[PDB]
Amino acid sequence: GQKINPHGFRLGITTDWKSRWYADKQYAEYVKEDVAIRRLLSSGLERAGIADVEIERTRDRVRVDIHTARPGIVIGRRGTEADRIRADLEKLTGKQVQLNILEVKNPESQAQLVAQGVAEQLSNRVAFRRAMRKAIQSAMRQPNVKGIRVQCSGRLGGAEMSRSEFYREGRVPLHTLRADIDYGLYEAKTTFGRIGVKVWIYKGDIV
Amino acid sequence: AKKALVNKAAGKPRFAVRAYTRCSKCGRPRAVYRKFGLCRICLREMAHAGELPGVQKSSW
Amino acid sequence: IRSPHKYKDSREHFEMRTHKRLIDIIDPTPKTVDALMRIDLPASVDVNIQ
Amino acid sequence: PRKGPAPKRPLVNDPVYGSQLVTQLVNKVLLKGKKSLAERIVYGALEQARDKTGTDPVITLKRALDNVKPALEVRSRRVGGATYQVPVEVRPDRSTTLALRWLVGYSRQRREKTMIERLANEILDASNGLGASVKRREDTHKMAEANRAFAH
RNA sequence: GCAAGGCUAAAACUCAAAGGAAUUGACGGGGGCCCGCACAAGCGGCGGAGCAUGUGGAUUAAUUCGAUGCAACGCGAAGAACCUUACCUGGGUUUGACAUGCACAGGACGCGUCUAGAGAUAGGCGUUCCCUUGUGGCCUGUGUGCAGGUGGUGCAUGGCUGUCGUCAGCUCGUGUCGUGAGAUGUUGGGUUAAGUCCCGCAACGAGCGCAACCCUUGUCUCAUGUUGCCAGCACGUAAUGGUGGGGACUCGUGAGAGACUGCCGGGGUCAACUCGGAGGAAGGUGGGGAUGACGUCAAGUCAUCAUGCCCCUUAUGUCCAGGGCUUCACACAUGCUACAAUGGCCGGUACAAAGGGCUGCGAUGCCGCGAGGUUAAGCGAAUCCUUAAAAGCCGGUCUCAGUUCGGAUCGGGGUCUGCAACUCGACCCCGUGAAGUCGGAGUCGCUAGUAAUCGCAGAUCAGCAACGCUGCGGUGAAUACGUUCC
Numbered sequence A: 001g002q003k004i005n006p007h008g009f010r011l012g013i014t015t016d017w018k019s020r021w022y023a024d025k026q027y028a029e030y031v032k033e034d035v036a037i038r039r040l041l042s043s044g045l046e047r048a049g050i051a052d053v054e055i056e057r058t059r060d061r062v063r064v065d066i067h068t069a070r071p072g073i074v075i076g077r078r079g080t081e082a083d084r085i086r087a088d089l090e091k092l093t094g095k096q097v098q099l100n101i102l103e104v105k106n107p108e109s110q111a112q113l114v115a116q117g118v119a120e121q122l123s124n125r126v127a128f129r130r131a132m133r134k135a136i137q138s139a140m141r142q143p144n145v146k147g148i149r150v151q152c153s154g155r156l157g158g159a160e161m162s163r164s165e166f167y168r169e170g171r172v173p174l175h176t177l178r179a180d181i182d183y184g185l186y187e188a189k190t191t192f193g194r195i196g197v198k199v200w201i202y203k204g205d206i207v
Numbered sequence B: 001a002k003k004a005l006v007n008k009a010a011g012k013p014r015f016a017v018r019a020y021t022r023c024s025k026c027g028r029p030r031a032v033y034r035k036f037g038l039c040r041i042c043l044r045e046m047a048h049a050g051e052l053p054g055v056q057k058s059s060w
Numbered sequence C: 001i002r003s004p005h006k007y008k009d010s011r012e013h014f015e016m017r018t019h020k021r022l023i024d025i026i027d028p029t030p031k032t033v034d035a036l037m038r039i040d041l042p043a044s045v046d047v048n049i050q
Numbered sequence D: 001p002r003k004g005p006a007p008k009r010p011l012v013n014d015p016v017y018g019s020q021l022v023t024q025l026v027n028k029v030l031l032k033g034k035k036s037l038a039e040r041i042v043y044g045a046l047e048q049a050r051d052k053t054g055t056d057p058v059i060t061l062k063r064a065l066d067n068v069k070p071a072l073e074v075r076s077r078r079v080g081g082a083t084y085q086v087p088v089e090v091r092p093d094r095s096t097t098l099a100l101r102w103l104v105g106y107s108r109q110r111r112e113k114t115m116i117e118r119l120a121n122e123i124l125d126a127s128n129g130l131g132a133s134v135k136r137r138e139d140t141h142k143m144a145e146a147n148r149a150f151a152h
Numbered sequence E: 001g002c003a004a005g006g007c008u009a010a011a012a013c014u015c016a017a018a019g020g021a022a023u024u025g026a027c028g029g030g031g032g033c034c035c036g037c038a039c040a041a042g043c044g045g046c047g048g049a050g051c052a053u054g055u056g057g058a059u060u061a062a063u064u065c066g067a068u069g070c071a072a073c074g075c076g077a078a079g080a081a082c083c084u085u086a087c088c089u090g091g092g093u094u095u096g097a098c099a100u101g102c103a104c105a106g107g108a109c110g111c112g113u114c115u116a117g118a119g120a121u122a123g124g125c126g127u128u129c130c131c132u133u134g135u136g137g138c139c140u141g142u143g144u145g146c147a148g149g150u151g152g153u154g155c156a157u158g159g160c161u162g163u164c165g166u167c168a169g170c171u172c173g174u175g176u177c178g179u180g181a182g183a184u185g186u187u188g189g190g191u192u193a194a195g196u197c198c199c200g201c202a203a204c205g206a207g208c209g210c211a212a213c214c215c216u217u218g219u220c221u222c223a224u225g226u227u228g229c230c231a232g233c234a235c236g237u238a239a240u241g242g243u244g245g246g247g248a249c250u251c252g253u254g255a256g257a258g259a260c261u262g263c264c265g266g267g268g269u270c271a272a273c274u275c276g277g278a279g280g281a282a283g284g285u286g287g288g289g290a291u292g293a294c295g296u297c298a299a300g301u302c303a304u305c306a307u308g309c310c311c312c313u314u315a316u317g318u319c320c321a322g323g324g325c326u327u328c329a330c331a332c333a334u335g336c337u338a339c340a341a342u343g344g345c346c347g348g349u350a351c352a353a354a355g356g357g358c359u360g361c362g363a364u365g366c367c368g369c370g371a372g373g374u375u376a377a378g379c380g381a382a383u384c385c386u387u388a389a390a391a392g393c394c395g396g397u398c399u400c401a402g403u404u405c406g407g408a409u410c411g412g413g414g415u416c417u418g419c420a421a422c423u424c425g426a427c428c429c430c431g432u433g434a435a436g437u438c439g440g441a442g443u444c445g446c447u448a449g450u451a452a453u454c455g456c457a458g459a460u461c462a463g464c465a466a467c468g469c470u471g472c473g474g475u476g477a478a479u480a481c482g483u484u485c486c
């Protein structure tokens, strides 16, 4: 409640937009369409581990790009689940949909995936102090990771008082603009409520 | 907001002057921008996430 | 307003820029207009023909 | 402030009368950014002074200022269970500033109609040593005199 | 023992501690050093009046809910006439306004008419497509799992935010000292805006913070020339760069240069660094913005959203019409307009920036005193409209008066938006012309393009914003001795 969003801070400097198009009059309903698309692709695909969704709209033609560590699940029974999802998107928009799953190289140095895995362990009742440490070690064993910070906050294991601990390895210069800091946020749905999990991954300054 | 109110707003009301805008994402009735159709909150989170092309923090 | 409730004095500004150029006056040669219409460009840039 | 003195700003000579005294006067009369109006008021006052006395207006103004400039002020201080006035010397530029402030402030509350003639009358009375501006300097000097005991 | 009293000296009962050293913090009307519109020096206000807005209280059928020292009170609300709306009265419905599972049946749906305040209900029509041949879509009706809840708990929570405070601190690894909590590093001497840096040292290194990278403003170079510019020619309509044209100037927008104590003098352990010069558009962080460490306040939010438990299910769900959220013996808070001559009114006239516009902006013309009405060129826009900036300058008048100040209140008549202007909209015209003559104790902001003052634009938006908010430009000051006091 005091730190700025790391992505928003550098948006337009280092990080880039996840939606690309130009629309003067058709801006509001493009936004309304994209939010519905994002609800759809967030529902049911949690097992698939979605990293980030990028949306491309090119003069009445929509190109949706999804990134995950396990494209086999999103495709399904060799092109059946993918076809069903594309049919859902077609029914949603009315415009012909081009759906693409590419790959996620390293779901160990990728925030919003590290965070999702940690939240999965919390939901499965693993000790948080162990899940956080294993995630941090897995991330620091990656090619280009100059540091990582992982923060969990909530009732943290059935406690009554909610608290917040965080661990840190390497260096994570949040205030620096020339940095390349990936951000990830996910919530674990434990039996006692929700638990927020935040991950900051620093991957060196710039190209 | 309540789903009954969200459906009522989405519908076509009697006396077209009665039509009002709600947030396209959360259903907030107040502080909804016409160009996005979002409330100020949902606008802020979407802009930080980068899901709104052309929008970015402003310094001058 | 940054907060979801009651903190009016804390705010945040956002822009939205639009860049405009290339009002060029190319000749309406039928073989040139061929290339003009068969070329397709990024969607992030909007192009209009007058 | 705490980190020593601050740089003061310089002024330029007045075109019609090549002095900075009348520039300080217009800056004392100026309100709400109406510098042209303040210049008009000051110029009219100087012209009325010239047309009533014959003498050069800036010379009359310098005489009035010499009459109303103080030498000792009475800055207040608290020591024990009582607070009492302490007479201190006045530096020259502060004396000129204070004299101009006194002239304009007392002319603003004279019983006449327009500020031009109010200020002209105040300047003439000060140059003659009669006005409330001179009375103020005399009262200041008397209070600085009646407290020489506390000259620590 | 003269006395005061001294000496020897219990118990009941009662408590689960009472204590000694030392550690980390916090605090002191302890000490040293340093800083901040903190004071001082100035300028302008608020507290007094009228009105706008929010709040307490009171009232009411309801005056929905939240915020409550700084850090609640022009706050959530960037727009309460219906709608919004979550509240009241009454009229309805109750697998529901909305999604799916399980069991039947076959049109759903749309159009129009009546009754009704409306919700809804009935008169009658278009129709069962898809092969309701079977699968399909859809729907009713019956139900049944349910859906729904702005119902509770912010002291169960996520997320988001304020605040101390843009204050300069907060820590870790190894090593060393101590039985231990811990300490050291992070202390000492200088220096800085800075835990900024240098010199020493049982510490050596590191991290988040500081600074820097980002945006904007300030100078120049190169590229560029339309819808932008107009120097040199023609053209000069009409002077409206209007036209041919030009690459000169500006400007527009791209890439660069430039500021680093870089150079010089003095100081300083020759170090950090400091004082003063040169050259430069700019000189020591050039001005401004974005950026909020570890944490604190069980700070704020279950009414953005999400959510664990609890609660309602012919109602605490849902639909509708009127009403309320706009009350008013009072109190507080933030503002606007004033109390006038540095002014009011009238006439003429000059100089901006930043933005908005197809369910839109309306140039021109005609009508109207005016708000406005009508026609309609152009314009998704450096080309059209918005577009007349106002203070300013010149002239005339008023002559110190509760006024030719002030513009509340009230009477009459209108315009527009909207199904609708009573409760409860803005604006215009005629009349009306209140308090108020500078404001007690007290209290607030501001150190330069600042304060003070003058207009313009946007968001929300049918209308309500020329008193709020977020911005833009115009004019443009006075002071700072200094750290005794708060």
Ligand SMILES: [Mg+2]
Binding pocket: B017, B018, B019, B020
């Ligand atoms: Mg409306």
Ligand SMILES: [Mg+2]
Binding pocket: none
């Ligand atoms: Mg002790």
Ligand SMILES: [Mg+2]
Binding pocket: none
């Ligand atoms: Mg102390």
Ligand SMILES: [Mg+2]
Binding pocket: none
């Ligand atoms: Mg003071």
Ligand SMILES: [Mg+2]
Binding pocket: E046, E047
């Ligand atoms: Mg006052």
Ligand SMILES: [Mg+2]
Binding pocket: none
């Ligand atoms: Mg008052």
Ligand SMILES: [Mg+2]
Binding pocket: none
């Ligand atoms: Mg209330």
Ligand SMILES: [Mg+2]
Binding pocket: none
């Ligand atoms: Mg306040």
Ligand SMILES: [Mg+2]
Binding pocket: none
């Ligand atoms: Mg305010």
Ligand SMILES: [Mg+2]
Binding pocket: none
């Ligand atoms: Mg209502």
Ligand SMILES: [Mg+2]
Binding pocket: E154
């Ligand atoms: Mg709380």
Ligand SMILES: [Mg+2]
Binding pocket: E186
């Ligand atoms: Mg410390």
Ligand SMILES: [Mg+2]
Binding pocket: E186
């Ligand atoms: Mg220590």
Ligand SMILES: [Mg+2]
Binding pocket: E195
């Ligand atoms: Mg440091």
Ligand SMILES: [Mg+2]
Binding pocket: none
């Ligand atoms: Mg910084």
Ligand SMILES: [Mg+2]
Binding pocket: E298
């Ligand atoms: Mg609390």
